[PDB]
Design a protein around this motif. Structure first.
Motif, PDB file in Angstrom:
ATOM      1  N   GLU A 141       0.847  -1.189   0.000  1.00  0.00           N
ATOM      2  CA  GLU A 141       0.000   0.000   0.000  1.00  0.00           C
ATOM      3  C   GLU A 141       0.884   1.242   0.000  1.00  0.00           C
ATOM      4  OE1 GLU A 141      -3.472   2.105   2.746  1.00  0.00           O
ATOM      5  OE2 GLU A 141      -3.272  -0.085   2.557  1.00  0.00           O
ATOM      6  N   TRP A 142       1.903   1.215   0.851  1.00  0.00           N
ATOM      7  CA  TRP A 142       2.882   2.292   0.948  1.00  0.00           C
ATOM      8  C   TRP A 142       4.074   1.777   1.737  1.00  0.00           C
ATOM      9  CZ3 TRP A 142       4.251   3.150   5.862  1.00  0.00           C
ATOM     10  CH2 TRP A 142       3.293   3.037   6.888  1.00  0.00           C
ATOM     11  N   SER A 144       7.560   3.286   4.133  1.00  0.00           N
ATOM     12  CA  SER A 144       8.359   4.369   4.695  1.00  0.00           C
ATOM     13  C   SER A 144       9.780   3.825   4.752  1.00  0.00           C
ATOM     14  CB  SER A 144       7.893   4.727   6.107  1.00  0.00           C
ATOM     15  OG  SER A 144       8.180   3.675   7.013  1.00  0.00           O
ATOM     16  N   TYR A 234       9.521   7.557  -4.584  1.00  0.00           N
ATOM     17  CA  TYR A 234       8.190   7.564  -5.177  1.00  0.00           C
ATOM     18  C   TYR A 234       8.244   7.551  -6.712  1.00  0.00           C
ATOM     19  CZ  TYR A 234       3.158   8.726  -5.227  1.00  0.00           C
ATOM     20  OH  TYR A 234       1.791   8.708  -5.387  1.00  0.00           O
ATOM     21  N   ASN A 238       7.761   3.802  -9.002  1.00  0.00           N
ATOM     22  CA  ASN A 238       6.586   3.736  -9.856  1.00  0.00           C
ATOM     23  C   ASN A 238       6.879   3.701 -11.349  1.00  0.00           C
ATOM     24  OD1 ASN A 238       4.176   3.682  -8.027  1.00  0.00           O
ATOM     25  ND2 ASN A 238       5.142   5.543  -7.219  1.00  0.00           N
ATOM     26  N   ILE A 248       2.316   4.130  -6.092  1.00  0.00           N
ATOM     27  CA  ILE A 248       2.361   3.578  -4.750  1.00  0.00           C
ATOM     28  C   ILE A 248       3.277   4.463  -3.920  1.00  0.00           C
ATOM     29  CG2 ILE A 248       3.034   1.664  -3.303  1.00  0.00           C
ATOM     30  CD1 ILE A 248       2.459  -0.188  -5.603  1.00  0.00           C
ATOM     31  N   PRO A 249       2.796   4.911  -2.753  1.00  0.00           N
ATOM     32  CA  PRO A 249       3.581   5.770  -1.864  1.00  0.00           C
ATOM     33  C   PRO A 249       4.871   5.125  -1.360  1.00  0.00           C
ATOM     34  CG  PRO A 249       1.290   6.074  -1.421  1.00  0.00           C
ATOM     35  CD  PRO A 249       1.391   4.859  -2.314  1.00  0.00           C
ATOM     36  N   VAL A 250       5.997   5.744  -1.690  1.00  0.00           N
ATOM     37  CA  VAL A 250       7.304   5.276  -1.239  1.00  0.00           C
ATOM     38  C   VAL A 250       8.020   6.534  -0.801  1.00  0.00           C
ATOM     39  CG1 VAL A 250       9.559   4.390  -1.889  1.00  0.00           C
ATOM     40  CG2 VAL A 250       7.502   3.277  -2.746  1.00  0.00           C
ATOM     41  N   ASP A 251       8.308   6.637   0.491  1.00  0.00           N
ATOM     42  CA  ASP A 251       8.960   7.834   0.993  1.00  0.00           C
ATOM     43  C   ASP A 251       9.672   7.583   2.324  1.00  0.00           C
ATOM     44  OD1 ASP A 251       9.692  10.485   0.818  1.00  0.00           O
ATOM     45  OD2 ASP A 251       7.737  11.271   1.464  1.00  0.00           O
ATOM     46  N   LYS A 270       3.377  -1.136   4.708  1.00  0.00           N
ATOM     47  CA  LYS A 270       1.939  -1.253   4.906  1.00  0.00           C
ATOM     48  C   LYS A 270       1.366  -2.183   3.841  1.00  0.00           C
ATOM     49  CE  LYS A 270      -2.159  -0.387   6.496  1.00  0.00           C
ATOM     50  NZ  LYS A 270      -2.751  -1.397   5.571  1.00  0.00           N
TER      51      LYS A 270
END
Length: 357
Positions: A141-142, A144, A234, A238, A248-251, A270
């Motif tokens: 989902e994401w 961190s 991010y 992607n 997809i959130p990557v940070d 997540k």
């Protein structure tokens, strides 16, 4: 056979590329033409000489790319441009290669007629090589991230500076260290003083790295507050996955530490649905032949999950796998990968191999 030109093959990334290529006898399946920027081997700036090549493999750098690439494409040259430099990374006519992860993306692009392939960011590549499975099941989902990045990603001079720094730190207390009865406080006092000395060599990093760390890599991006490096999490994750429409959130945070050539990364992932830890592992382990799932065991973790163990190898160990207190949806993972291999030269070598088959 295909006529392939090589530029920047004498640099650090280029050298790793050349070595891996010999190791795998890659030169036997193509006609190699070597270029040079020196005026003291063909000229890397000779557009007509480059026009005759079916493929261009450059590890020279962005400036070179930005200067020569347009002119060459300007003559109508229809060949392939393989770049290790990030210049074209985000171009619509360019694809970021990591075949063990995005072969399907690579194939399609080839179909469409994409002629420009670029190696991806080391941290993002090492991540995907480690947890590709999760993405391959659309379970992420994401994510961190917190990184422990090596000096080699900065450059050859940075690696030397790290080592020199380590030398002076010890030299500052060399005799005290040998005396088993000496005060530890007096020692750190001196080490810390040397670290802060005007003569402590920090020109390349702009700060001490040995005996410390720098929580900042690349320039700041006003828009998001991230640094260019963090921003690539991010963007690049992607683009590589072909998820330009459903990103997809990557940070997270990118931090440099006193390691020579392996990046390490702590993840908080997540997951979309809750799955048994064991099922997640199997998914992770089965994605590709290089990723290596290290059991959440102390002794084995100390032997396998470290820069010390992975440096100079193609193995991508992932460990400390377990659920996080925030919920069964949260997974913890730690990985280690060589920045110069899967984070640089190896992805390049692999696309070339395909283009000359």
């Amino acid at each position: 056979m295909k006529n392939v030109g090589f530029i920047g093959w004498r640099g650090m990334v280029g050298s790793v590329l050349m070595d891996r290529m010999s190791q795998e006898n890659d030169f036997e399946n193509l006609n190699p033409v070597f270029f040079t920027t020196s005026q003291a081997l063909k000229s890397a700036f000779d557009i007509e000489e480059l026009k005759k090549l079916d493929i261009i493999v450059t590890c020279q750098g962005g400036d070179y790319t930005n200067e020569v690439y347009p002119k060459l494409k300007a003559t109508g040259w229809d060949g392939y441009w393989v770049d290790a430099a990030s210049a074209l990374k985000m171009k619509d006519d360019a694809i970021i290669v990591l075949d063990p992860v995005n072969q399907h993306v690579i194939s399609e692009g080839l179909k469409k007629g994409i002629k420009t392939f670029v190696g991806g960011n080391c941290t993002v590549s090492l991540m995907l090589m480690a947890i590709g499975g999760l993405f391959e099941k659309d379970l992420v989902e994401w994510i961190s991230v917190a990184t422990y990045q090596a000096a080699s990603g900065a450059g050859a001079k940075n690696m030397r500076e790290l080592l020199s720094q380590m030398g002076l730190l010890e030299q500052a207390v060399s005799s005290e260290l040998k005396d088993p009865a000496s005060s530890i406080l007096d020692i750190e006092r001196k080490v810390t003083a040397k670290m802060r000395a005007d003569n402590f060599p920090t020109d390349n990093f702009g700060a001490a790295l040995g005996g410390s760390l720098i929580p900042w890599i690349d320039k700041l991006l006003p828009e998001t507050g991230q640094t260019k490096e963090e921003w690539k999490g991010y963007a690049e994750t992607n683009k590589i996955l072909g998820l330009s429409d459903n990103p997809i959130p990557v940070d997270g945070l990118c931090v440099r530490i006193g390691a020579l050539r392996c990046h390490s990364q702590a993840f908080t992932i997540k997951l979309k649905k809750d799955l048994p830890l064991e099922e997640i592992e199997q998914i992770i382990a089965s994605h590709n032949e290089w990723v290596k799932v290290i059991p959440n065991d102390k002794e084995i973790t100390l032997r396998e999950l470290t820069p010390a163990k992975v440096t100079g190898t193609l193995s991508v160990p992932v460990g400390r796998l377990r659920k996080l207190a925030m919920g069964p949806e949260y997974l913890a993972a730690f990985t280690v990968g060589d920045q110069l291999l899967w984070g640089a030269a190896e992805p390049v070598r692999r696309i070339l191999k395909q283009l000359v088959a």
